[PDB]
Amino acid sequence: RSPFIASDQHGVVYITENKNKTVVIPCLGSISNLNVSLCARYPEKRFVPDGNRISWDSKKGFTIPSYMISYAGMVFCEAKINSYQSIMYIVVVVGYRIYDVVLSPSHGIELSVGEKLVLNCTARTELNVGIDFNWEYPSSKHQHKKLVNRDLKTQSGSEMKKFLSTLTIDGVTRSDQGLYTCAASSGLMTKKNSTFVRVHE
Amino acid sequence: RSPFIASDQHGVVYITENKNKTVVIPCLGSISNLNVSLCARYPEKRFVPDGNRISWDSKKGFTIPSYMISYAGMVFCEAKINSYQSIMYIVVVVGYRIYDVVLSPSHGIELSVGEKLVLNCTARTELNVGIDFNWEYPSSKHQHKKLVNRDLKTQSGSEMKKFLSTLTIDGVTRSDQGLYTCAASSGLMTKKNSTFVRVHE
Amino acid sequence: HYNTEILKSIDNEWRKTQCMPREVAIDVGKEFGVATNTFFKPPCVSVYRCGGCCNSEGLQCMNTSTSYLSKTLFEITVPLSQGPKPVTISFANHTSCRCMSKL
Amino acid sequence: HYNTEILKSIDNEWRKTQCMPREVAIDVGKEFGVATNTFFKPPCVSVYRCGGCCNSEGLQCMNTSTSYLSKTLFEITVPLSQGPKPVTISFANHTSCRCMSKL
Numbered sequence A, B: 001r002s003p004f005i006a007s008d009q010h011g012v013v014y015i016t017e018n019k020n021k022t023v024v025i026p027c028l029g030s031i032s033n034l035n036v037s038l039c040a041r042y043p044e045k046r047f048v049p050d051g052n053r054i055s056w057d058s059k060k061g062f063t064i065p066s067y068m069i070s071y072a073g074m075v076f077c078e079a080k081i082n083s084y085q086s087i088m089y090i091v092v093v094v095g096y097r098i099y100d101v102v103l104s105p106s107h108g109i110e111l112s113v114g115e116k117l118v119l120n121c122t123a124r125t126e127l128n129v130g131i132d133f134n135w136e137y138p139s140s141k142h143q144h145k146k147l148v149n150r151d152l153k154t155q156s157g158s159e160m161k162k163f164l165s166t167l168t169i170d171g172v173t174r175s176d177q178g179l180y181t182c183a184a185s186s187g188l189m190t191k192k193n194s195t196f197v198r199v200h201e
Numbered sequence C, D: 001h002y003n004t005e006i007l008k009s010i011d012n013e014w015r016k017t018q019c020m021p022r023e024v025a026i027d028v029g030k031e032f033g034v035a036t037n038t039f040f041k042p043p044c045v046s047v048y049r050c051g052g053c054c055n056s057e058g059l060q061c062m063n064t065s066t067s068y069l070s071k072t073l074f075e076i077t078v079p080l081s082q083g084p085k086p087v088t089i090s091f092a093n094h095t096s097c098r099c100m101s102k103l
């Protein structure tokens, strides 16, 4: 039916951090002698090969410096003989950096049996980042545990995102005494931080 | 030209606090035998006499319980023989109540020459209220005085408006020692409050 | 007279600013208030919410009837192990508004 | 297939939610940020401001060109000694928007 041949009816494109700064849309063509452009939206923008930098190879698909399509919700290559087009590829801009993981309180947690423990883990990251938290604590034997994950607003407008995970134990016991390690995970990158919670009479 | 005869090309209507709860739009007519209705907007609402309560007298104009037109931006009466209308009357809903006028600090202001004096006057009022502040202080002889009036947000959503006036003298002197009286004025109603500012070495 | 010029514009102003349903963008992950590790593509949905101004403080713009709408969005989660998954979310759509008393 | 049904709606969603000029009501006495004793009739004005969503955080919806508009409103002051007085105020009107980098 179509010159373009690429699994699903829609594909995915990820703008990870440069270089190359160039992203590849796999618009693999059935023919070689085709004048292909890259259509991005919204708003509508058309991008035309300027060898060498922007280019379409019939074996590699379209290649564009990713800053030009980062704004976009979705892209697709368009070839015309007299107008065919590829499948829609969703643009996902993906951050990965975590600046710092900080616990609160940071140091010297002294508690007595029955007291409330409240750990605040906070991860600060670059933009286009989401985080999954994974905690590690002495009593993986479940006893009155509670975990709440929140979005705090950096803005400010700074250039960052700030995330909060909050551990809670209502009646600490001596089994719960030990190392508490909160892990923050963004894309692939992962940063850990820990404090010692001491429990005695 | 027109059956309606009423100064300017637009009139004003004030919804002050009830009773009667009824407001009068002076749609004085040239004739008696006219079927007049009250058009209010926005949105469009038409109101028709239901004697006795809603009524139009050729000598008094239109009379409506003011809750029915309180929502409105503007009103006008409309009479038809085969459609004439009156002039536009702007609807102004007007509050008057001040709940309390409180100063901060409230009591025992002790200062030494050179110190900064900061008086915070706060008026809390019902809705549809605006306030003008007028202060009274020992040194009407002008010396480094500053007055800033602000809107603080009751909401909350309560059922009120909260207003702040802030007096400031940078280098208090012994002439400035005395009674400070902040007056809050809303429509006609006016409430005053005072504190004594003491200045010594 | 020139007074008609001012009157024309001011009546028009009241009309355009009244309490009525208005097309707005809604941040999805904020209404649903999802998560630290959850992204939506698209980030928003076009839906009608009540806006405008009431002439008397003590009346605020509120909807009097609401439809609901199921829109389909691709949900992305991190760490990305998938896979944008087509999920549906049900968004409120206001069909009528009125300046109703506050309390 | 049914995938076209989902695709159709989602492209349409991106289109309706893009960074573009949008008619909004502006509280006058808040932009001008007037006073404790100053009321405006009408309370608002209809003007176009940039709204919508950017697909990448780090781009926000900002206007790239602005017209200004003089509207006439009756200003009321208290204690009412007048007299609604016809005053004019100059409001910004956005004519183009773009998702531009934050810093």
Ligand SMILES: *[C@H]1O[C@H](CO)[C@@H](O)[C@H](O)[C@H]1NC(C)=O
Pocket: A020
């Ligand atoms: C960017 O890096 C890729 C590595 O796969 C390489 O093939 C490409 O030629 C590079 N671009 C330039 C301009 O060297």
Ligand SMILES: *[C@H]1O[C@H](CO)[C@@H](O)[C@H](O)[C@H]1NC(C)=O
Pocket: B020
């Ligand atoms: C409301 O009070 C006015 C006083 O001017 C009076 O003329 C009118 O009749 C009153 N309404 C009723 C229902 O008594």
Ligand SMILES: [Hg+2]
Pocket: A038, A039, A040, A044, A045, A046, A078
């Ligand atoms: Hg295109």
Ligand SMILES: [Hg+2]
Pocket: B038, B039, B040, B044, B045, B046, B078
């Ligand atoms: Hg009417």
